[PDB]
């Protein structure tokens, strides 16, 4: 299905799709915002912002090219998007502004106009996005003063500090041929983009990236950027997870997938199997909620967010969905991981079976740039019909039960306890 | 290993309590018999038995 | 919500001893409280399980505060208790007036 | 229920205190009541003997009984009127029944 | 605390026995004319006690003019409780006119109930 | 600053951050109250229990 | 082949109390006796007939607990 | 429950006097140092008790940045006596900083209760 090859220094990865109708080839890197530093964090936003410039990409719409970019903790990803029959305008275009000829798009007078607008775009990010500057801020404060801890956009205070160097610099130091996979998705094959990608001799930079001296650890926390002015009560809380290449990572998403996601003002999400609603919904303690798995190289997180309008009876929402918690170690039934099973087999199947062949660009270089190569749909399905009871207690008993967590908070939050409330909550005393 | 140590004596809170209680009860008892030997020695021929002793000789 | 709350004497409870929200920077004075009503505590059951051996004419008082002080097993130690304990129940009581005296708690909300 | 069960405790308490009190006035028929209701307690087949002996204070009922039964019969009615506070409490949460059996939230009287 | 389904059910094999219908029907008559609700103007369905949950929707599921004749004659019941009389008799309620009206609502809810907990001790056959 | 940037918790953070070392000790510590609490409530309540059992003047006259 | 229905069971239960959560709190609370019966043998140490019957029959922690006081120096 | 009327009419008769202003003041900023608020990173006007309906409007009336400021400084002096520290010396207030600032909204509080209660009380002169 996936096929992966190693040329002269560039790893090239395919999903070849013969029914659809767009193609989408690009480059794919390994060194999202966990490569930075404190003070120039927000690089990879300024690239993929110079990169989607409006003369970068009406050169692309001359050709008929739609760009576009991705920015995460591990992985950042380039990808143009085209017609079947144009792959090599994509493939040129890509070589010859981003690859080579770099010096056009860090032109001053486009640096100042592109930092302006990502320094406009991170400002209404930070105060009118609540329920992800909290997550921002959950991953900020579960792995403080470790390169895990820094906010994807940046930060106000460090993107006002960048010049053109800066972002030169980093492209030295990361945007290389052992730091990248060609991705090619939607109905290109693979020995077209092979054939093209040797039939231009296309090589990004000769280096090795800078190894970094720690690794990401877990430091349980909390963080309150409380503000009485806000309607709702914002919370994400999380525990340390798994890391992707662990045994336990469908563990850990089948572990969310059995407490779910839930909306109040939705009909058919009040009426899900989770023994979470039964409890929050007589007194209306909640508005959402989304329990994750997010998993990165170094680390993991396993959690919930929520928001809330109920300010009064926020530790009873917390309390009654960590007493639910905390039936994965006791009593965690056969029908829950079947009904999780199947929800899980369904969302995997919409996240990796979609339409979009710039999604698919993005899941196959971050997972062949991570472990080499990618685990087919097949094979994760036979891996999530394997679970049983035991690997779930077993997996709780390990990550969840009597854990520290880390908590950010925005909002309304004078209602949340504190963190040795919700810490003691981790673990009931046997009853 | 503090891994097994927490699985079997700190994760479930029954064998906790219960550990607590079994050592109340070993420690009452060897605590008693301790303080009773160190206040009858240290009181050595001014007890009782020590008087009768010496008055049975 | 939690039983804790929705009980009618949990609380009560709860809403006194486990959820009250307490100023975070109030000093090992405002433990004066919690002591003096462990005082009465003491009061109360050593002075109960001494009135089970006492009798209260004037011919029989101090000869069964004896009866309690010698051969009523650990008498000594209700009688010691109830005497020290209500000697250490006004030295307690005596702070806490100091300290509302000292810190302003006389003052206009109680 | 909870209302009808803290009844059920204050009218086990009441038995109690009235008994203790009929025992303290050493009448004939008090002090043999006190026996047969003591030894009632024998029965029990291994701890029987010393919960009957720790209740006399002695071997039958004597002085320490009678102190005992008095300490006793004066300090349970202030459980019961701890207990009836309680009732009050169980009760006014959902308010008083009527004779017809449905909902008197309809009209109301202060 | 026997809910209405069980009720149902034995009522239903009662009434469709032509043995058992024809011995035990008189005597619930008679017991419906004894019990002496009528007598205060009210319908049985107004008798049934509130206060669960099964009976809270089924209330707020009953029609706006059902329930202002219902609180209307419960009402009266009361008033007339606090005099130690009872209606004229013109004003009780008549056989035709004791009608099960909450009954459909409370099978309702009830069927939703226990359709509820026997979804949530829900067991797959894998 | 900031608020992305959290301040110096170096001088009171523990260099070796095993969750089962610190848990353990500190259930260690409660449990060592908690045995400590228990043996000198079970010898508080048999204090005043045994001072209910006889009296030596009637256990002379038994 | 294709799945047209459901095939279920509902199993055991009385309200919230499940059998599988029976099987699943069977154990800890087998521990749950045994601490509290633990907590017995705390809490009637000093009682005689629990001693003479039970806490004295500890191989080590026998003779601990009674006295040799010689029948010669108690006036009862 | 002194005025702050009073406090201001005899504290501006010291400071508008020439001979006792230059004796009473040195002894009130050393009785001001000795106070040792400002250690805790406190301005006076965040010492005033706040549990009156003249402090309530004073603080409703305050602006909204004011407020932000004094609910820091008021949260940052429990963190500091929590720990039993002090502030260290570069976070103290000064002496320039000190500012009276929620005095003229008391003031006027104040005058606005005393003339209500002096119109309550009118008596017309016929
Ligand atoms: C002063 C007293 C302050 C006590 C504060 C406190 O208990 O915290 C409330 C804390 C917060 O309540 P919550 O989070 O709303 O309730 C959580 C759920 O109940 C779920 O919580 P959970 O399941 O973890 O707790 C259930 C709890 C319930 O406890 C029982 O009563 C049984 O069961 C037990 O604790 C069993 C303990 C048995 C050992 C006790 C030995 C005594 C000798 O709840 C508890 O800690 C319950 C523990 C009971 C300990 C106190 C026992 C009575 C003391 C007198
Ligand atoms: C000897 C003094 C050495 C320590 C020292 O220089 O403290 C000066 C220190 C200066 O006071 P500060 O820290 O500016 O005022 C804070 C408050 O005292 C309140 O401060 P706090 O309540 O956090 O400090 C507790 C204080 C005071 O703690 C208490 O007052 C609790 C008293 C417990 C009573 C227990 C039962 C009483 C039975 C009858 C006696 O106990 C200590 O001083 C422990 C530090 C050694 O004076 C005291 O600490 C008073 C100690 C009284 C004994
Ligand atoms: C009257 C006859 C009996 C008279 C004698 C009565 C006994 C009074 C003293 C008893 C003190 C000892 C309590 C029992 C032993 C003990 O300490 O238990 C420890 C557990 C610890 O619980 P934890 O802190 O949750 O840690 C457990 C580890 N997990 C499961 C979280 C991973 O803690 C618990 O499970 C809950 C313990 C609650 C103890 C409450 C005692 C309160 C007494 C004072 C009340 C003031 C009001
Ligand atoms: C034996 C009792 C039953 C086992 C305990 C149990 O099973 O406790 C489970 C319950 C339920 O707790 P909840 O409110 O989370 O559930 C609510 C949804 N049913 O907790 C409690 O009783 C509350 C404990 C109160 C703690 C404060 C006590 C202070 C006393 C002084
Ligand atoms: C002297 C004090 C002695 C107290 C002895 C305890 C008596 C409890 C009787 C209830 C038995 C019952 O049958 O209770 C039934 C109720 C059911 O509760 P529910 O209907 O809410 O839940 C229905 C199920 N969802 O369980 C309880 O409430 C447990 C109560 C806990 C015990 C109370 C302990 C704290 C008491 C503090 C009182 C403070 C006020 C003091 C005066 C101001
Ligand atoms: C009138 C007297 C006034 C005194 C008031 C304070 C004394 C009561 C303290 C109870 C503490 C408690 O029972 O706490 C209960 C805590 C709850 O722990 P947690 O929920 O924080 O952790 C939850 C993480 N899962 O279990 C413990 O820690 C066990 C250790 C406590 C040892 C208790 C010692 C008993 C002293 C008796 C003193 C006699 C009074
Ligand atoms: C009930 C209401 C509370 C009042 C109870 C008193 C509480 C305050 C006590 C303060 C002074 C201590 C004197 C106690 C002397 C004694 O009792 O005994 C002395 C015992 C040892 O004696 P022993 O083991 O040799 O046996 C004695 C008979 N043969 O020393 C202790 O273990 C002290 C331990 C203190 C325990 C504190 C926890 C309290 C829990 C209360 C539970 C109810
Ligand atoms: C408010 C709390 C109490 C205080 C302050 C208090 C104070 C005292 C004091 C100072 C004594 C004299 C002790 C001595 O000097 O030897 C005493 C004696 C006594 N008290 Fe209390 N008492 C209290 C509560 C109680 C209660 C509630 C009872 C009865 C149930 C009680 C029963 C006795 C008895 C029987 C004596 C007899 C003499 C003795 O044994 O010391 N006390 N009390
Ligand atoms: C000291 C004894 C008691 C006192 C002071 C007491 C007090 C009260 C009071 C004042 C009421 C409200 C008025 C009323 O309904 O009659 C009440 C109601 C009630 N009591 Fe008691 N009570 C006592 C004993 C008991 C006992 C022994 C029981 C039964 C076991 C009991 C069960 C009830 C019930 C069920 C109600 C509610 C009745 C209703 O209103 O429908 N009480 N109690």
Known sequence: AEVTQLSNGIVVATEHNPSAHTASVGVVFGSGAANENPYNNGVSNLWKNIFLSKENSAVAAKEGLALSSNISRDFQSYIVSSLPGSTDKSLDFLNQSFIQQKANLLSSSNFEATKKSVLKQVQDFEENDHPNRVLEHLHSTAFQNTPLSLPTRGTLESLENLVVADLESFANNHFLNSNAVVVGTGNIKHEDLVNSIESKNLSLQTGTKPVLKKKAAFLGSEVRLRDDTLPKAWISLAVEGEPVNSPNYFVAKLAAQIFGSYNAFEPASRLQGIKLLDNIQEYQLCDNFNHFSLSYKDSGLWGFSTATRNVTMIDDLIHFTLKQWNRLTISVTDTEVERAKSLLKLQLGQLYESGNPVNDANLLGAEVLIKGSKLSLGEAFKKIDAI???????????????????????????????????????????? | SFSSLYKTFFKRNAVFVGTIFAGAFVFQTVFDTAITSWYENHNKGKLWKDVKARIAA | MAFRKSNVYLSLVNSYIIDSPQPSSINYWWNMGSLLGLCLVI???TGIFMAMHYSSNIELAFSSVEHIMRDVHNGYILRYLHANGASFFFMVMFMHMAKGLYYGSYRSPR | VTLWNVGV?????????????????????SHWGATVITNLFSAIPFVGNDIVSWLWGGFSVSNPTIQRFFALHYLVPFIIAAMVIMHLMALHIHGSSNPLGITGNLDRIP | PQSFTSIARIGDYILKSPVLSKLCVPVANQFINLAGYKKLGLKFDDLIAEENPIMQTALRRLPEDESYARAY?????????????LLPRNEWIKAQEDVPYLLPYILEAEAAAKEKDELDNIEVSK | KSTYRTPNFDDVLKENNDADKGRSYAYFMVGAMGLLSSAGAKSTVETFISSMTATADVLAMA | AYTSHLSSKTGLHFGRLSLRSLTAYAPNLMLWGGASMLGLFVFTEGWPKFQDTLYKKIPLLGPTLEDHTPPEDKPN
Request: aromatic share 10%; proline share 0%.
């Open chain 5, 73 to 85: 004659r419960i009402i009266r019941a009361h008033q007339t409780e606090l005099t130690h009389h």
């Open chain 4, 9 to 29: 405790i204050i009218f086990i308490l009441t038995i109690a205190t009235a008994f203790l009190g009929y025992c303290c006035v050493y009448g004939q028929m």
């Open chain 3, 43 to 45: 009061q109360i059951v």
């Open chain 1, 388 to 431: 049983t009871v035991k690997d779930v207690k077993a997996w709780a008993g390990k990550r969840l039960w009597d854990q520290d967590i880390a908590i950010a908070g925005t909002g309304q939050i004078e209602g949340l306890l504190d963190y040795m409330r919700i810490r003691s909550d981790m673990s009931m005393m046997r009853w």
